[PDB]
Amino acid sequence: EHVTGKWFSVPELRLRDHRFIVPLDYSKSSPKITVFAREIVAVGKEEQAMPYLLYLQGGPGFEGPRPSEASGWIQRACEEFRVVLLDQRGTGLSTPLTCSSMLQFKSAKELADYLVHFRADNIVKDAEFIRVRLVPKADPWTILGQSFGGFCALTYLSFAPEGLKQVLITGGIPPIGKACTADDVYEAGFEQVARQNEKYYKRFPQDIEIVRELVNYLAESEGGGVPLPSGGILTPKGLQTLGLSGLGSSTGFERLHYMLERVWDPILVTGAPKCISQFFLNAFESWHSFDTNPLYALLHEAIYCEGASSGWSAHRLRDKYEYKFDAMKAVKESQPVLFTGEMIFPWMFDEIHALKPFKAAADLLAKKEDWPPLYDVPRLQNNKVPVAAAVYYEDMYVNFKLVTETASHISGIRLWVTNEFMHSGLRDAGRQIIDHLLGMINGKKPLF
Amino acid sequence: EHVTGKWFSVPELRLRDHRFIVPLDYSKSSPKITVFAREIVAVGKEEQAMPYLLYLQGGPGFEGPRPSEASGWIQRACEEFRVVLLDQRGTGLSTPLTCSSMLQFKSAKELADYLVHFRADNIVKDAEFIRVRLVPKADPWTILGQSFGGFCALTYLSFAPEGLKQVLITGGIPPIGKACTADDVYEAGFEQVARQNEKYYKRFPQDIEIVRELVNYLAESEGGGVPLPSGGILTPKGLQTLGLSGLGSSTGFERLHYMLERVWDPILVTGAPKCISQFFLNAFESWHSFDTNPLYALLHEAIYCEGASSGWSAHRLRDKYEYKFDAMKAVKESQPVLFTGEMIFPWMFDEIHALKPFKAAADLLAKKEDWPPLYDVPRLQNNKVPVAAAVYYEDMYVNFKLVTETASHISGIRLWVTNEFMHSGLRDAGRQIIDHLLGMINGKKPLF
Amino acid sequence: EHVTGKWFSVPELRLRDHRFIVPLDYSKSSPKITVFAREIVAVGKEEQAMPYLLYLQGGPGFEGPRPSEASGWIQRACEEFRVVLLDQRGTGLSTPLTCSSMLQFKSAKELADYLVHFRADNIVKDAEFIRVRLVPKADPWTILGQSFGGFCALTYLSFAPEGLKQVLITGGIPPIGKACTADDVYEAGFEQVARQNEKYYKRFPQDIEIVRELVNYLAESEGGGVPLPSGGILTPKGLQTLGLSGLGSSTGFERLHYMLERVWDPILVTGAPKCISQFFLNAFESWHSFDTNPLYALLHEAIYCEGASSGWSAHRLRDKYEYKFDAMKAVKESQPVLFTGEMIFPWMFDEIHALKPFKAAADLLAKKEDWPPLYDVPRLQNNKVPVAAAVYYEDMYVNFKLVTETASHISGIRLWVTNEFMHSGLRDAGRQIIDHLLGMINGKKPLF
Amino acid sequence: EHVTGKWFSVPELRLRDHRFIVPLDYSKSSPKITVFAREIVAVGKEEQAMPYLLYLQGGPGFEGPRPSEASGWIQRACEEFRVVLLDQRGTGLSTPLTCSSMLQFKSAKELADYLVHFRADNIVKDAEFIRVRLVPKADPWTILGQSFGGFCALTYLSFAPEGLKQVLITGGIPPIGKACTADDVYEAGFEQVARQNEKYYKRFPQDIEIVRELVNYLAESEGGGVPLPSGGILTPKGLQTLGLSGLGSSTGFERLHYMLERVWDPILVTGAPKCISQFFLNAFESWHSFDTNPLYALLHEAIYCEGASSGWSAHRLRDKYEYKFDAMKAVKESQPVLFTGEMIFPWMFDEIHALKPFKAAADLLAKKEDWPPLYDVPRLQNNKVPVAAAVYYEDMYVNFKLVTETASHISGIRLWVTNEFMHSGLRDAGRQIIDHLLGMINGKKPLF
């Protein structure tokens, strides 16, 4: 089954939507799920025969871009390609596993045994099920992957590379070659997270006292925290999560300072006490995404598993660095408190109200040993499909050593190391990323 | 008293903060208030002498711009001046009246006697208190007003105009010359709101069935609306206020369609009912500002009063148009339901959870009939300060027929009527708005 | 003693020469030396007071840029500073140690005791001697260093750091922290040279056979070679030095392909023997710089020495890599012949006619211990001068691993890593380099 | 017989080489010669049908462009045409007549009887033999020629107008209508050469003494000169030959001044004699091209012959101007000494070491009568092929008055006179030269 809507406009572009009915598990005919994609073109090119580009989104539970106008990489891509934006399984409009949707299962065993079908390998099987129907004569297409969309791209080079014309990857080469790589990722991740904290306080020296005051006030409170507007808790452990975007994203240092300006509430009536501001508690409750995209909490470590369980791998490895990462040791010893990022911890399923009912199913995932494979190293060592990659030298989401060690196992890969961009660099000056990566494959900047 | 911080850097900008201690009520010495402003200059110009520019922010209750990069109108303004961004009284870092802050007052009589000090005719006395201390030799300065910041600028042209070099306005010309203009504003408002709804359903035709089905489900639920995560309710009246920014801001039409794509949850497991999605409820609760900036609800109609009571004028006028604006009538007579904007109603203080304790103080303000005046028409009728205004022809938030009569009383005003921007226009290619406005005063485009 | 010439013109640029009389060695009063510098400004600014910039030239033994028009980085720099181009002592117009000029010394010991005064520390004492006489008020100035000019810049951050406003470096961070780093620099050099040879034959597959047929005819010829026009000899060991400019720079891969097409001359008269072409022998003799800049042979390995000898360290290291770099093993075993990098060898003073008499003085330098030091790590660790550096990821001359660890010993250095450019990146796209490196210090890009 | 190679890449361009067998003399069909042309296109256009363009390099005996990137005129031409670069017979890869290769001929008569086949009429026979099997359908093509390449192009319009779509010329219009025009060319040549020397010493006044001191030293030296590194001799007549490219070409004035700074070696040891520098003698030996392209000396005056001999016409014409061009008279009278233009003299074969053995064959050519035709004026007077020419008003190499008489005989020629450019202009402003000349033919700039 395949159905599609009428064309519609946003300023400078034309858009259309497609819906497919596809197997839950390709080992069976039944049950089915819906999968959704949106096709985009520049004005006046609705019927024109052109090459196709597939975009694969940057994170385990995130949806396709949803543009309001032509800008950035989409505007540029539309100068050459039909652009296809795919809503990955369980997110966006492709059978969504919202915090309300996952309450339909009676028991944690049923939820865990459903969630295992949503992973990188099935995302690639759905992309192949789309191009054989969407593309004229079932021709090959180009793919662009950001972050986790780059991990999907290496699974596509490993299995069914016959559909690929050329591959572009931004900030998205994974480590490969072990039954679970998660321990090597987080052991290196804490070192970049520590260095990004160094840069933040070096730029904004005044904040060291502000976070100190706030960590005391949250810890001296009767529960080790304070209630948020949506019935969750803010605690000194919860405060340390702001780094996930506040340190690793391109506007993060700028925004994190402007939020720490508004922490306390003013005394209007004399004799009233000093208090935490409702504006800060509302802003914190709106900063993260886990209460909205819960697959980014549940399936995060499972992207590294290829034959063994992760067992809450980030939570083990925090104990190797907790002499500097404990907020309570920091305030006692007069050290700055350190923020953390791209890593998840068991206690988040206690403090975040929307995750409360999934505490059991998250452990059944964390303990699963029998994860199927994601990559094929003997094939990648023999690859024929052209590959270009943007590699960021100071990236906290994927470590540079793990990238360059892996790049030796892809046969023909060309890559540019640059220091000039954060992990967000396909959004921030995205136009020149697409020009530079296409230029290598197209032959404008030949082997150098 | 006046205190000044150290400079800090944002990409291509240099920023510094100033804090002033100011009378609550200028009729006496004390109590005091703290007022905050941020001074901005381009790289390398911290010590250079240049003309000053003051920005007056566009809404009751809003903080100033908070820039994370140079690019926008601020980049242009920094080519010639050292832009000053003022957090208005009670709105931002200037002793904010957050929800948690307003709970300090023991009775509705105390809160209502305090909120009356937070109007436009005091925001202009703070601006005069600042320039005599901030500007070299206390020289005159130019002022830029967006929306409600234009209403402040007209009080400045009538009271203490001696400090002004020239005035630039975007939207923001009020009706003047009655004791309460709010009836006249809202009688015009429902006409543009009806028109803009026509255009929305002409552009996205399939949404006519999506809102219908949703209004029926919200009417059939127990006690009407479904409960929101913060303890509010989504009634079909609450669904109609979604159009406030959705129909009147430049990105609003596309963003409102992409929200209506997400309404229901998928039937993942057999026998589970059709159900409203946690994503839609969270997005709805994140859409409006009244919990974040409650001073925008409390003092909205009170900007139109000069010695007469508003008495919930927006709610009186709705009954004149109820034959088309009643959502229950639309689902029975198969007509499209209409959304609304820039109008606040009594029931919001029953239903938006953050506003629940302030209902009594909102009625004491709504029934007040002895406000001081905002304007002085005999002085506007003798004005010598140069004035340039950008006037948007199809503006939802201030009406063209009321602007064009008021523009006859300002003695030397030049104004540029255009269809090509919505009310958000200073944030939508603001570089050309500031160049075109300055070109009319400076003499690049002389009178014709 | 100090003299200066009259201004003269070049398209869009106005030049002027200054000549200084300087001691041969400091801590003594005599003998003297002349040192030459050339001031450059954009049109009409000759009388205008501006900041100064000094350019330190990139090869040991090379004269300054000598421009024919305003172009590249000189066109940019003259928008802001009064660029000074320095002919380093022993080069250009500054006491030139030309291949006939050095024949005035009656013995090899006499010559060797002269050449020891021409290192990087004395180049910084010359630059200090210029500033205090040339610059108004004797103020600080900004220094720019390509390659070995970056080695000079780190001695200027080690000794006399008071003269510096800010430092810019390009492909020029030295290794630091050992008595002689040359064995490491070379252990790493043969690794990158092997990589660049792989890319060359991967791009031009036909050249594998053309260098194997050529190495054979040269090995079969008398003495294993053929006579050059100046009476030197071409041998299979001598042919490998084409890799220096051929593999390490930005036009070398193309220039080296167009030269290898020209190797054999045609049979015009039947029965005439197959012979080596005069265009190839003339272009090979014209390809290197050792006939023109003999100081680039004699002092080259000495730039890595502090209190220990080099002892022909590049020749000592090729013995570890012999099995791939030997050209006669390569033809016997049917493998491609490799070309070599920025290395000097004992035999090079026998093959090249211009170097023949300096063979004895080369050994007296190569075996010399008690070289005075160049760097002061305990001052680099607590530096306060701003420093920016362009660092190239696939550089053949300075190894990335040695650069990135040495950058950790400068207190505030802002390096940017890139793969976009080769070592020549200030000549090609030089505008970008000055805008980006100034932008990291000036404030256009703050720390992230 | 025709062969073609595989494609290869340089930055922004794709290149391929074609090799053809042609007769030595078209009247006998034996012996054979191989001719080489390189085809160039922009990226991704290898297969696409677009019009061909032929380029004629225009130094007698010089190699075609040999590009390493897209820049100048080739970057622009490839926006419209399939560019074909022809190595003219006897140079580049088209069976080279280099020094070592001409030494196969047994006697001067054999050599002279070979060289008479390497002229401009046969270059057109070769170019027509290529079009008929390289171009699809054997269609017409556009041609471009600088200098002697425009010489060639008027013989193409004389003898094979069927193949020409249009003609573009950049200062290659010769004076036709006599049996040998060389006496007219050199009579008008010494006038320009004198006026260019007056501009040089007016721009660089300090050089007047430098050349005088150097002419005295060369004349007083043993045997009337100083020995070059290659075993040639620098005599004072040899020093005057710098002007060939030092005056008439675009950077010549700049370069020639920087070279005259380097003349003398310093005195490092007290009482050493003052001496001519090894840098200067190596630079002078590297300045001229006659060692690299001996066909440029041997077949120079032969381009002006159409039935009468040249008889060393430049050497004879010099006698009319000897009162100012003799360097020995100039020093004795205390006048400036003048550099010479593009011209060749009998003594060059006694002083340039590579030319020494060809002295006899040069005189057999210089005495040859019965040279065949080059032009057909009764066809040029009724030509129908479109022609566009860039004509330079102060050109050293082709005299303007000889162009303006010849341009009256071509029927449809449009020419633009300019003083903006020296003779080199197609390499200095390439882009705008091709845009301006095509603009006359295409109808951008109609008759006016």
- Structure tokens, A301: 């470590």
Instruction: Catalytic residue, from B94, B147, B249, B313: name it.
Output: B147
d(CA C392, CA C385): 23
In the three-class reduction of DSSP (H, G, I as helix; E, B as strand; rest coil), residue C421 is classed as: coil
Nearest of A248, A145, A246, A253 to residue A189 by alpha carbon: A248
d(CA B245, CA B248): 5
d(CA D83, CA A57): 43
The label of the residue with tokens 């990821």 reads C393
CA B425-B429-B435 angle, 5° bins: 95
Chain D residues close to C94, C-beta within 8 Å: none
CA A129-A49-A160 angle, 5° bins: 25
Do the Cβ atoms of C104 and D269 come within 8 Å? yes
DSSP string, B157-205: HHS-GGGEEEEEEES-PPP-SSSB-HHHHHHHHHHHHHHHHHHHHHHST
d(CA D79, CA D204): 42
- Structure tokens, D346: 């009998």
Give strand pairing partners of A37.
A18, A86
| B198: CB partners within 8 A, 6+ apart | none
Torsion-angle region of B161 (φ positive above 0: left; ψ -120 to 50: alpha; else: beta): alpha
- Structure tokens, A428: 């921030």
In the three-class reduction of DSSP (H, G, I as helix; E, B as strand; rest coil), residue A53 is classed as: strand
Which of A250, A422, A447 is nearest residue C199 as measured by Cβ atoms? Answer: A447
Do the Cβ atoms of A203 and C447 come within 8 Å? yes
Answer whether A410's CB lies under 8 Å from A387's CB.
yes
Amino acid at the residue D143 = I
Interface with chain A: mutation pick from D8, D9, D10, D69, highest number of A CBs within 10 Å? D9
Amino acid at the residue C27 = S
Instruction: Catalytic residue, from A68, A319, A370, A408: name it.
Output: A370
Q: Where are the beta strands (DSSP E) in D147-208?
A: 164-170
Q: How many CB atoms lie within 10 A of CB C310?
A: 25
Answer whether C121's CB lies under 8 Å from C151's CB.
no
Amino acid at the residue A350 = D
d(CA A55, CA A39): 11
Please tell me the number of Cα atoms within 13 Å of B176 on its side-chain side.
25
Answer whether A20's CB lies under 8 Å from A2's CB.
yes
Chain C residues close to D95, C-beta within 8 Å: 266, 268
Per-residue CA distances from D65 to D123, D135, D251 (Å):
17, 21, 18
Chain D residues close to C275, C-beta within 8 Å: 100
Per-residue CA distances from C52 to C86, C442, C444, D197 (Å):
13, 16, 21, 36
Answer whether A21's CB lies under 8 Å from A33's CB.
yes
* Phi (first) and psi of residue D35, to 5 degrees: -120, 140
B:C CB pairs within 8 Å: 14
Chain B residues close to A102, C-beta within 8 Å: 268
In this complex, whether B and D touch, counting 3 or more CB pairs under 8 angstroms, is no
| Secondary element (H or E) of residue C84 | strand C82-87
Chain A residues close to C419, C-beta within 8 Å: 415-418
Distance from CA of A51 to the nearest CA of D (A): 15
- Structure tokens, B92: 């931002």
Instruction: Catalytic residue, from D147, D245, D310, D313: name it.
Output: D147
C:D CB pairs within 8 Å: 105
- Please list, residue by residue across A35-62, b when 16 or more beta carbons sit within 10 angstroms of its beta carbon and e when fewer do: bbbbbbbbeeeeeeeeebbbbbbbbbbb
Which of B99, B229, B255 is nearest residue A230 as measured by Cβ atoms? Answer: B229
Answer whether B215's CB lies under 8 Å from B236's CB.
yes
| B71: CB partners within 8 A, 6+ apart | none
| C425: CB partners within 8 A, 6+ apart | C170, C171, C250, C390, C392, C433
The rounded radius of gyration (Å) of the Cα atoms in chain B is: 23
A:D CB pairs within 8 Å: 13
d(CA D66, CA D45): 20
A277 touches chain B (CB under 8 A): yes
Nearest of C185, C22, C170 to residue C90 by alpha carbon: C22
Q: Is the dihedral of CA B223, B227, B231, B235 positive or negative?
A: negative
For residue B357, say if its preceding peptide bond is cis, omega within 30 degrees of 0: no
Answer whether B7's CB lies under 8 Å from B16's CB.
yes
| C331: CB partners within 8 A, 6+ apart | C212, C215, C216, C219, C337
The label of the residue with tokens 């703290």 reads B34
Q: How many CB atoms lie within 10 A of CB B183?
A: 17
Active-site residue, B291 included:
no
- Structure tokens, A3: 């159905």
Neighbours of chain C (3+ CB pairs under 8 A): A, B, D
Active-site residue, D423 included:
yes
The rounded radius of gyration (Å) of the Cα atoms in chain D is: 23
* Phi (first) and psi of residue C255, to 5 degrees: -55, -40
d(CA C122, CA C89): 9
d(CA D164, CA D52): 11
Amino acid at the residue C342 = E
Do the Cβ atoms of B261 and A8 come within 8 Å? no
d(CA B160, CA A275): 38
d(CA D176, CA D153): 13
Instruction: Catalytic residue, from D18, D288, D300, D423: name it.
Output: D423
d(CA A29, CA A46): 35
- Structure tokens, A170: 């931004």
Torsion-angle region of D271 (φ positive above 0: left; ψ -120 to 50: alpha; else: beta): left
Nearest of C418, C426, C429, C425 to residue C393 by alpha carbon: C418
Distance from CA of D34 to the nearest CA of C (A): 10
Interface with chain B: mutation pick from A17, A255, A268, highest number of B CBs within 10 Å? A268
Q: Where are the beta strands (DSSP E) in B222-339?
A: 226-227, 233-234
- Structure tokens, B129: 């208190």
Chain C residues close to A203, C-beta within 8 Å: 446-447
d(CA C66, CA C360): 33
Chain A residues close to B96, C-beta within 8 Å: 262, 265-266, 277, 279
Helix (H) and strand (E) counts in chain C: 19, 12
Contacts for A20-24: CB closer than 8 Å, 24+ residues apart: A20/A126, A20/A129, A20/A130, A20/A133, A22/A126, A22/A129, A24/A117
Answer whether D30's CB lies under 8 Å from D23's CB.
yes
In the three-class reduction of DSSP (H, G, I as helix; E, B as strand; rest coil), residue B53 is classed as: strand
From D7, which residue of chain C is nearest by alpha-carbon distance?
C204
d(CA D186, CA D402): 11
- Structure tokens, A448: 């150098």
d(CA B410, CA B415): 11
* Phi (first) and psi of residue C391, to 5 degrees: -120, 125
Nearest of D248, D296, D253, D252 to residue D399 by alpha carbon: D248
Answer whether B397's CB lies under 8 Å from B58's CB.
no
- Structure tokens, B19: 């804090």
d(CA D348, CA D346): 6
Active-site residue, C423 included:
yes
Torsion-angle region of A342 (φ positive above 0: left; ψ -120 to 50: alpha; else: beta): left
Q: How many CB atoms lie within 10 A of CB A269?
A: 12
Q: How many CB atoms lie within 10 A of CB D404?
A: 14
Question: How many residues belong to chain A?
Answer: 448
Do the Cβ atoms of A446 and D11 come within 8 Å? yes
Question: How many residues belong to chain D?
Answer: 448
Per-residue CA distances from D24 to A249, B98, B151, D33 (Å):
71, 97, 92, 6
Answer whether C50's CB lies under 8 Å from C111's CB.
no
Do the Cβ atoms of B44 and C445 come within 8 Å? no
Chain D residues close to A446, C-beta within 8 Å: 9-11
C201 touches chain D (CB under 8 A): no
B9 touches chain A (CB under 8 A): yes
First to last CA, chain B: 48
C435 touches chain B (CB under 8 A): no
- Structure tokens, C201: 């034959």
Per-residue CA distances from A135 to A14, A49, A139, B132, B275 (Å):
18, 10, 6, 68, 35
d(CA D249, CA D255): 10
Beta-sheet pairing, C2-4 with B414-418: unpaired
d(CA B353, CA A229): 10
Locate all alpha helices (DSSP H) within D38-137, ordered by sequence.
72-77, 99-102, 108-115, 120-134
B45 touches chain C (CB under 8 A): no
Answer whether A401's CB lies under 8 Å from A185's CB.
no
| C106: CB partners within 8 A, 6+ apart | D269
- Structure tokens, C311: 């002892």
- Structure tokens, C185: 């620099």
B213 touches chain A (CB under 8 A): no
- Structure tokens, D56: 């004629």
- Please list, residue by residue across C380-409, b when 16 or more beta carbons sit within 10 angstroms of its beta carbon and e when fewer do: beebebbbbbbbbbbbbbbbbebbeebbeb
Do the Cβ atoms of C419 and A419 come within 8 Å? no
Nearest of A180, A410, C157, C255 to residue D67 by alpha carbon: C255
DSSP string, D379-439: HHTT--S-EEEEEETT-SSS-HHHHHHHTTTSSS-EEEEESS--TTHHHHSHHHHHHHHHH
Interface with chain C: mutation pick from A393, A411, A414, A421, highest number of C CBs within 10 Å? A393
Give strand pairing partners of A243.
none
DSSP, res D118: S
Chain C residues close to D199, C-beta within 8 Å: none
| Secondary element (H or E) of residue A84 | strand A82-87
d(CA D284, CA D287): 5
Burial (0-12, 13-18, 19+ Cβ within 10 Å), B414 = middle
d(CA B448, CA C239): 78
d(CA B174, CA B404): 10
Beta-sheet pairing, A32-42 with A82-87: antiparallel
3-state per-residue secondary structure call for chain B: CEEECCCEEECCEEEEEEEEEEECCCCCCCCEEEEEEEEEEECCCCCCCCCCEEEECCCCCCCCCCCCCCCCHHHHHCCCCCCEEEECCCCCCCCCCCHHHHCCCCCHHHHHHHHCCCCHHHHHHHHHHHHHHHCHHHCCEEEEEECHHHHHHHHHHHCCHHHEEEEEEECCCCCCCCCECHHHHHHHHHHHHHHHHHHHHHHCCCHHHHHHHHHHHHHHCCCCCEECCCCCEECHHHHHCCHHHHCCCCCHHHHHHHHHCCCECCCCCCCCCCCECHHHHHHHHHHCCCCCCCHHHHCCHHHHECCCCCCCHHHHHHHHHHHHHCHHHHHHCCCCCCCCCCCCCCCHHHHCHHHHHHHHHHHHHHCCCCCCCCCCHHHHCCCCCCEEEEEECCCCCCCHHHHHHHCCCCCCCEEEEECCCCCCHHHCCHHHHHHHHHHHHHCCCCCC
Do the Cβ atoms of B100 and A204 come within 8 Å? no
| D206: CB partners within 8 A, 6+ apart | none
Nearest of B32, B137, B133, B151 to residue B84 by alpha carbon: B133
Nearest of C229, C305, C295 to residue C61 by alpha carbon: C295
CA C174-C177-C183 angle, 5° bins: 70
d(CA A186, CA B243): 45
d(CA B168, CA B386): 9
A262 touches chain C (CB under 8 A): no
- Please list, residue by residue across A391-419, b when 16 or more beta carbons sit within 10 angstroms of its beta carbon and e when fewer do: bbbbbbbbbbebbeebeebbeebbbbbbe
Answer whether B30's CB lies under 8 Å from A270's CB.
no
Locate all alpha helices (DSSP H) within D204-347, ordered by sequence.
207-220, 236-239, 243-246, 252-260, 278-287, 295-298, 313-317, 322-325, 327-333
